[PDB]
Amino acid sequence: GLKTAQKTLFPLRSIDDVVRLFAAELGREEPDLVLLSLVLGFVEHFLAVNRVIPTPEFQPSPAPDPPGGLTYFPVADLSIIAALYARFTAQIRGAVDLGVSSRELVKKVSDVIWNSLSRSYFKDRAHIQSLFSFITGTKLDSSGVAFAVVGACQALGLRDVHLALSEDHAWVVFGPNGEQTAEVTWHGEDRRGQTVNAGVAERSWLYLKGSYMRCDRKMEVAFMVCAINPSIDLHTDSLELLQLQQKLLWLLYDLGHLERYPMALGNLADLEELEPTPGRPDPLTLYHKGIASAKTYYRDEHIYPYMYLAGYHCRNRNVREALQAWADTATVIQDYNYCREDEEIYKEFFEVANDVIPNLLKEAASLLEAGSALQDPECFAHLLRFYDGICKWEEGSPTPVLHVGWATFLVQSLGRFEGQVRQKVRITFQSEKMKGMKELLVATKINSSAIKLQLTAQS
């Protein structure tokens, strides 16, 4: 059952109503993860899953239809939300018979979630992150399973069970000092029931060498807020869900609950880039706050803080700063071993190397044709440092990184820098691969076939 202080806040008729419910919950020692996730999932379902109103091309009279379209909000009645809340609690409270939780108990709660899920659905669909999705559709995405287990543990009074988050995987931590770990969901087959010890030991990006986020209840709220998915379709985001996420992230920010959450700070900066809130820090300040957070709390072993920053510089045509931030990105990855479950960060580096940097340099070339970053040997050195970090990442790893297609874009990006610029650098490389082709990189003529042979040499 819901406390009367919670019920008095319903019905929710606006974004602001939702923000007040979140503000009220975050003022308590145990913000109700199940209540809050159900509200967000309900609002998201009727704003993005079933879009009620779609998202026109002057005259003396008023226009027949709203000339700028409509935004809307689906009213969240207490009756609807409490009914779903009671459904979840009856389910969880019934399936387990009851300040440190044991491994046997955590596995039990995890199994309750796991075995409730549909046997066959597309695990990568949008809008199956929330407990609304779990209750009304018996479907959860990978990290949504972990969040639901944490939520179920809170509903059972297991105050020591918490969400653990890397940059692409989720599990639970528990025990005396939060040092116990259990896999509860799949990634990518599954390691459910295992500890994460072997993943931390293999130095894969997926477990961040142990420098992963151990949430408290307030960061679990921040997680579900980051989990809002505004996509209506591939080309259309719900303005309302973006605005809801933005107001909620600022609320969490002001309470200090994004201090140890770098990707949440980058998320907020991305939103401020599109819709700046007057009186708030500008996006660059927030991007640098996320980098400072990763340095302070996670040993500077996170990748995305620098990709957030680089992307902003890229969209703002700050070529020098973008290239330096990508070089900084590769400098963090170079100390990891590329493992089989690391595909997500691989795809991000792939798009940077083979699309975003080529586009950035083509943009810069269009300015020069009409000082330019393409005439700056520091920019060229940053490009080489980016590839050096990727090569060192690959070096000695169980999985190859570079393939022939990467060499095509490298040759093209090298060519964007005139030989007279390239011949000015004096660089030392970490990777054997880059050491083995330093002279090819600074030669007046760029030997495409040799660079392809060298970049594709087997690790």
Binding string, residues 219-258; x marks residues near ligand A1AVF by CB under 6 A: ----x--xx-------------------------------
| CB of 432 vs K ion, minimal distance in Å | 11
Size of the site for K ion (CB under 5 A): 4
Kindly tell me which of 32 and 342 has the beta carbon lying closer to K ion: 342
Kindly tell me which of 186 and 409 has the beta carbon lying closer to ligand A1AVF: 186
Name which position in 153, 165, 357, 451 contacts ligand A1AVF (CB under 6 A).
165
Strand duo 213-214 + 180-182: pairing: unpaired
Residues 350-409 that bind K ion (CB under 5 A): 395-397
Kindly tell me which of 141 and 376 has the beta carbon lying closer to ligand A1AVF: 141
Kindly tell me which of 178 and 210 has the beta carbon lying closer to K ion: 210
Residues 6+ apart with CB under 8 A from 377: 421, 422, 424, 425
Binding string, residues 291-330; x marks residues near ligand A1AVF by CB under 6 A: -------------x--xx--x-------------------
Residues 101-130 that bind ligand A1AVF (CB under 6 A): 129
| CB of 448 vs ligand A1AVF, minimal distance in Å | 30
Residue owning tokens 């109700």: 32
| CB of 129 vs ligand A1AVF, minimal distance in Å | 6
Name which position in 32, 44, 168, 259 contacts ligand A1AVF (CB under 6 A).
168
| CB of 396 vs K ion, minimal distance in Å | 5
Summarize as ranges the residues that interact with K ion (CB under 5 A): 337, 395-397
Summarize as ranges the residues that interact with ligand A1AVF (CB under 6 A): 129, 143, 165-170, 223, 226-227, 263-264, 266-267, 304, 307-308, 311, 348
